[PDB]
Design a protein around this nucleic acid. Structure first.
Ligand SMILES: [K+]
Ligand SMILES: [K+]
Ligand SMILES: [Mg+2]
Ligand SMILES: [Mg+2]
Ligand SMILES: [Mg+2]
Ligand SMILES: [Mg+2]
Ligand SMILES: [Mg+2]
Ligand SMILES: [Mg+2]
Ligand SMILES: [Mg+2]
Ligand SMILES: [Mg+2]
Ligand SMILES: [Mg+2]
Ligand SMILES: [Mg+2]
Ligand SMILES: [Mg+2]
Ligand SMILES: [Mg+2]
Ligand SMILES: [Mg+2]
Ligand SMILES: [Mg+2]
Ligand SMILES: [Mg+2]
Ligand SMILES: [Mg+2]
Ligand SMILES: [Mg+2]
Lengths: 219, 305, 110, 115, 154
RNA sequence: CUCGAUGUUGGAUCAGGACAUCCCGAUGGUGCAGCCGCUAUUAAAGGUUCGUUUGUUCAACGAUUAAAGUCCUACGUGAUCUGAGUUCAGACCGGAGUAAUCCAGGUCGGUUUCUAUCUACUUUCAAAUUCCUCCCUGUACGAAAGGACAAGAGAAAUAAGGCCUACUUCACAAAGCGCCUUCCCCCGUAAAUGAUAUCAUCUCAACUUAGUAUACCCACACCCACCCAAGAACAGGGUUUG
RNA sequence: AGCUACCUAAGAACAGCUAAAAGAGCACACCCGUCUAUGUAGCAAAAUAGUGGGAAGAUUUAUAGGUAGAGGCGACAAACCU
């Protein structure tokens, strides 16, 4: 079972009724628009109504580098290099102007966010806008593309080698020396892994969310 | 002479029994008020220009996006009407003001934590106590019999409301956060002076003027947001969807009133008057009333063309 | 900044004896029914807690004598037995701590 | 997004904008009251030691949702009339600029790619 | 402003806080009942409950073993967690400890607590007890309850 | 008046006030067709940019702007900051002196203490300003050139006040770079009727016109303890989560 | 003249790296005190943290001795001489 990540609310003092009501609108909009399963690292094509585009329809293809937000506001960022110009668009999953979301290639990466592609070599952010969808077999495990990208020289938009980022899909061996790596470890927080009270267990939250999803589809 | 709380002297057996007893009583007091029109209501007058009706007490549930047919995104605040009842009527004569008043109450709280005079008041009304009580200036033709329930559909989409709550309390704050003072440079010699007020007056007057902006307690005061459009009413859960943001933290109580901004004067001709009575309404309202410009969730995708 | 003037004892008596600076009478003191000594309602009885602590310390000295070294916490439950007591059926396979005195009336054999 | 001293990338094919120079083109004025330029705003450039008006057609700062964000701060040189100085814009530009066809008809006319 | 901040600032910083809470939790696992300043015991109490849940995962669970190894600084207590304490609480789903305020500390007058794992072999703490059902008030309420039961049947 | 000390030019910060008004409002005149001006009466609610250069105030210059006002406040404000300048001890150049030294002539360098006793003050106060576009309209007005206005509709900026759905910094939250809301007036004159002075006359004649808030707050336990979006303490909210 | 200025007698210290003629470079110990902040009845009647200058030399430093106020001593700062 894949539950799209915007259905699991962040920890907080919000009254659960509010998430229930919001889930009902997310599920109604999903009846109109099929929102497919995707991850950071999947190649998507989004079609949107644009009052100023030619034909009043826009299509963008790119790699999902971020999925963020919760509820009806939840978004994802598609990134592509177009005529050698890097570009990215943050789409709203439930914006009624979205006409179609197509998963050209369904895959997963070694990291939950690919914002470091802004500092990787342009090839790792370039995807053909007319590439044909790859077929995904039924009841098959989602593939994890284990590409470790090569980076541009420093400085980067963020300090990707710092432990707080916990990035695994960068060829740090090529771009950073051992002394540069030793410095970054000074920000490591080994106790953080074991702080049991920081863990946010949403297993029981998801079970109830699945009952609502099944209830809406049943009726 | 020592203090006592409600369960201090109760036994292991009597504590669960007393809680069930007080809860059951409250639920049935609330259920006894669900039919105001069969209980000898006060006269239901027609709306007239210059007429002012009551508002509500709601709870701030949170914020949510919605989209209009134009494709514009608006954020809205969900205000849930939780056990709103009229509590008191004060005639124009006894109010000492130019208008009659109607006291309304919001959220059910514990009878164990309320003062006796307040408990004595609610016992005579026949309701569980409310957390917050607010006073609404009404015209004589808008009076409602105390004990009458108030609902979210008292308001309708397209209307404007003023929302009043206490702002988020930020405690003691310096001038930068409190008043937007610039502070002082970070470097270039500054000695222990980065977030300070600077001068607080001129030398000549030998004093500081009343009203001078200084460090102090910030927030936790009553503000009103004027002129918020009602985009949607969910009548099943009693949610109002007001445009934008409202003062206070989520789960706080807010006062919702027909907007007093002049543009919106005498727009209550088509609003429920004096209030909405669901028991009287012949045809039940749908679960959701929408403003005409709102893209409804199951509506087809926007397609500019 | 220094005082421009000495503060009089009359000014200082109005500050020092202000009801805000006075100690407040407590109203949550009561008698412990078990021992008769005083306690606060929300705090354990000092006397009864000490009695329990003195015996816990004695039992812990016995646990120390049996373990006989650091890093020797056992992997089974423990029972404390007093003079004239024997392991019951449910105390088999437990580490037994023997106390050379009679079981206190308040530390019931459960 | 674009303010005084921001270095911009001229993305049209003007000779002024593409000729090599020792100093990168630099915004010296934003024709907006708050002084912060966004897509569709005009700025003044110090380019090749000269002063030339330009139109912002992309920037790195996040905008509203559903709008493109570019890896560079992109401008198109214009005349005080509004007419483009070049004749081809190869790099993609936001479709939102097509809302200002009134002011920017000629500049939109030389745009090959839209995003 | 500290709205919604759920943890205390203790020790010398965030790593120091954990090391304080770890040392306390280690003592609680050895002795089953420790006394310490009230706020630290309050802060430590959440972790002592979580430690049992990891122990209930079993010693063949690699993650639970890695968690126990961090939190128990004396290693003979790691087998005690999995083989004594956790089997003791297999029936319960929570509430493995009880925490009680004891009188302020003599030297610095610090507010103090005693915390213990339930079901330990130590002499019982002098817990607070509710009034007996036989008091005047509780007998008037008992009468009230049964009168209701009678009318409820009707 | 102060030499048993009232230290500090310019800047930062925060600005109180005047009105002799720079801009926005209302008028009168015009060598005012219109568009712009010029001049005067009224108006101090609101506003009055960022840079290069100089320690600079001053000025020049580059870009703007509705406008980049003049002034006072111990040349406002240094127990809030800065110290470039300024002005002690070091040193250099030119000049003056026999020399020691000296020069509102340049130059480089050169310790800015203070735990607040009193006064005062610390959420006045929820009414908002301005530009631009469209439109009126290529109309009025002009031979043309050109070229508007009490309306109407938008879209902004700034200033207040909030808030976190999304984005962003982040992550049980606080934030801005994000979002939401913002509501009266003002008097100068211009005109009727009309006597003293049987016309006339807007009248320190009697007279008639332009032309005078609401909102918020609001009931009172225990005052054991616990919890909190409330908070320095205190107070407040919740516990029918003891 | 147990500080400090200068001197006498007789001692001691100076890692690594580069270069290799060494008042060479980098860089510790060590010596000094450029700049910033802190501190200003201090931790301190001149400090602390960082950043610095030098670090086989006109170097730094332990010991004992010498020069004395109309004086000494001085790579002149009218320096230093408890
Ligand atoms: K003097
Ligand atoms: K000084
Ligand atoms: Mg600043
Ligand atoms: Mg200082
Ligand atoms: Mg500082
Ligand atoms: Mg030049
Ligand atoms: Mg004096
Ligand atoms: Mg001022
Ligand atoms: Mg002055
Ligand atoms: Mg002197
Ligand atoms: Mg010469
Ligand atoms: Mg000379
Ligand atoms: Mg110097
Ligand atoms: Mg100087
Ligand atoms: Mg002070
Ligand atoms: Mg060297
Ligand atoms: Mg010397
Ligand atoms: Mg000399
Ligand atoms: Mg001299």
């Amino acid at each position: 079972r894949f539950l799209s990540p915007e259905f699991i609310p962040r920890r907080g003092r919000t009254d659960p009724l509010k998430f229930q009501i919001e889930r009902k609108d997310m599920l109604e909009r999903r009846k109109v628009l099929h929102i497919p399963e995707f991850y950071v690292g999947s190649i998507l094509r989004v079609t949107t109504a644009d009052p100023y585009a030619s034909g009043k329809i826009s299509q963008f293809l790119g790699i999902c580098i971020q999925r963020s937000g919760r509820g009806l506001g939840a978004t994802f960022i598609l990134r592509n290099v177009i005529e050698g110009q890097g570009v990215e668009i943050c789409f709203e999953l439930y914006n009624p102007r979205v006409q179609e979301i197509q998963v050209v290639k369904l895959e997963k990466r070694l990291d939950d966010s690919l914002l470091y592609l802004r500092d990787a070599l342009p090839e790792y952010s370039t995807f053909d806008v007319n590439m044909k969808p790859v077929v995904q077999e039924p009841n098959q495990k989602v593939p994890v593309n284990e590409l470790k990208v090569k980076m541009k020289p420093k400085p980067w938009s963020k300090r990707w080698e710092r432990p707080n980022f916990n990035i695994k899909g960068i060829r740090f061996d090529l771009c950073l020396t051992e002394q540069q790596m030793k410095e970054a470890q000074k920000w490591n927080q080994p106790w953080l892994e074991f702080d049991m009270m920081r863990e946010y267990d949403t297993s029981k939250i998801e079970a109830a969310i699945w009952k609502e999803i099944e209830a809406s589809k049943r009726s | 002479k020592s203090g006592t709380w409600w369960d201090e002297h109760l036994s292991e057996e009597n504590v669960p029994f007393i809680k069930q007893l007080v809860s059951d009583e409250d639920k049935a007091q609330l259920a006894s008020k669900l039919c105001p029109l069969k209980d000898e209501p006060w006269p239901i007058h027609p709306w007239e220009p210059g007429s002012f009706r009551v508002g509500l007490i709601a709870l701030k549930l949170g914020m949510m996006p919605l989209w209009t047919k134009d494709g514009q995104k608006h954020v809205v605040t969900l205000l849930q009407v939780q056990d709103c009842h009229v509590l008191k009527y004060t005639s124009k004569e006894n109010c000492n003001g130019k208008m009659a008043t109607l006291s309304v109450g919001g959220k059910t709280v514990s009878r164990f934590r309320k003062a006796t005079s307040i408990l004595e008041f609610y016992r005579e009304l026949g309701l569980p106590p409310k957390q917050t009580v607010k006073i609404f200036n009404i015209t004589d033709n808008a009076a409602i019999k105390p004990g009458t329930p108030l609902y979210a559909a008292h308001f309708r989409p397209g209307q404007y409301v003023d929302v009043t709550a206490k702002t988020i309390g930020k405690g003691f704050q310096g001038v930068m956060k409190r008043w937007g003072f610039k502070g002082q440079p970070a470097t270039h010699g500054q000695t222990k002076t980065h977030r300070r007020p600077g001068a607080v007056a001129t030398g000549d007057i030998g004093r500081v003027w009343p009203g001078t902006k200084m460090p102090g307690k910030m927030g936790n005061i009553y503000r009103t947001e004027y002129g918020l459009k009602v985009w949607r009413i969910n009548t099943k859960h009693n949610i109002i969807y007001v445009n934008g943001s409202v003062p206070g933290h989520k789960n706080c109580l807010v006062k919702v009133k027909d907007s007093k901004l002049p543009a919106y004067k005498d727009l209550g001709k088509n609003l429920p008057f004096p209030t909405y009575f669901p028991d009287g309404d012949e045809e039940e309202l749908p679960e959701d009333l929408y403003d005409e410009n709102v893209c409804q969730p199951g509506a087809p995708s926007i397609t500019f063309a | 900044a220094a005082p421009k003037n000495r503060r009089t004892i009359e000014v200082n008596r109005c500050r020092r004896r202000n009801p805000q600076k006075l100690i407040k009478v407590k109203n949550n003191i009561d008698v412990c029914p078990e021992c008769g000594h005083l306690k606060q309602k929300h705090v354990l009885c000092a006397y009864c807690y000490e009695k329990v602590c003195k015996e816990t310390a004695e039992i812990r000295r016995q646990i120390g004598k049996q373990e006989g070294g650091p890093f020797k916490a056992p992997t089974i439950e423990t029972v404390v037995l007093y003079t004239g007591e024997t392991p019951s059926e449910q105390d088999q396979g437990k580490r037994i701590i023997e106390r050379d005195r009679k079981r206190p009336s308040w530390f019931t054999q459960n | 997004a674009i303010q005084k001293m921001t270095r911009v990338r001229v993305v049209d094919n003007s000779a002024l904008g593409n000729s090599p120079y020792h100093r990168a083109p630099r915004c010296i004025h934003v024709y907006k009251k708050n002084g912060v330029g966004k897509v569709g705003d005009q700025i003044l450039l110090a380019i090749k030691g000269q002063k030339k008006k330009a139109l912002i057609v992309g920037h790195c700062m996040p905008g509203p949702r559903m709008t493109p964000r570019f890896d560079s701060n992109n401008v198109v040189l214009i005349e005080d009339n509004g007419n483009p100085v070049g004749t081809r814009i190869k790099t993609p530009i936001p479709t939102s600029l097509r809302k200002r066809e009134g002011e920017y008809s000629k500049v939109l006319a030389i745009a090959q790619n839209f995003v | 402003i500290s709205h919604g901040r759920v943890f205390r600032r203790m020790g010398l910083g965030p790593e120091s806080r954990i090391h304080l809470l770890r040392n306390l939790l280690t003592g609680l696992v050895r002795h089953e009942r420790i006394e310490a300043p009230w706020a630290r015991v309050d802060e430590m109490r959440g972790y002592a409950e979580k430690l049992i849940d990891y122990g209930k995962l079993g010693d063949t669970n690699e993650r639970a073993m890695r968690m126990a190894d961090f939190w128990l600084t004396e290693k003979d207590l790691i087998p005690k967690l999995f083989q004594v304490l956790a089997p003791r609480y297999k029936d319960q789903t929570g509430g493995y400890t009880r925490m009680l305020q004891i009188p302020n500390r003599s030297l610095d007058r610090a507010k103090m607590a005693v915390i213990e794992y339930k079901g330990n072999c130590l002499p019982p703490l002098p817990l607070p007890r509710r009034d007996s059902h036989l008091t005047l008030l509780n007998q008037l309420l008992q009468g009230l309850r049964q009168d209701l039961r009678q009318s409820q049947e009707a």
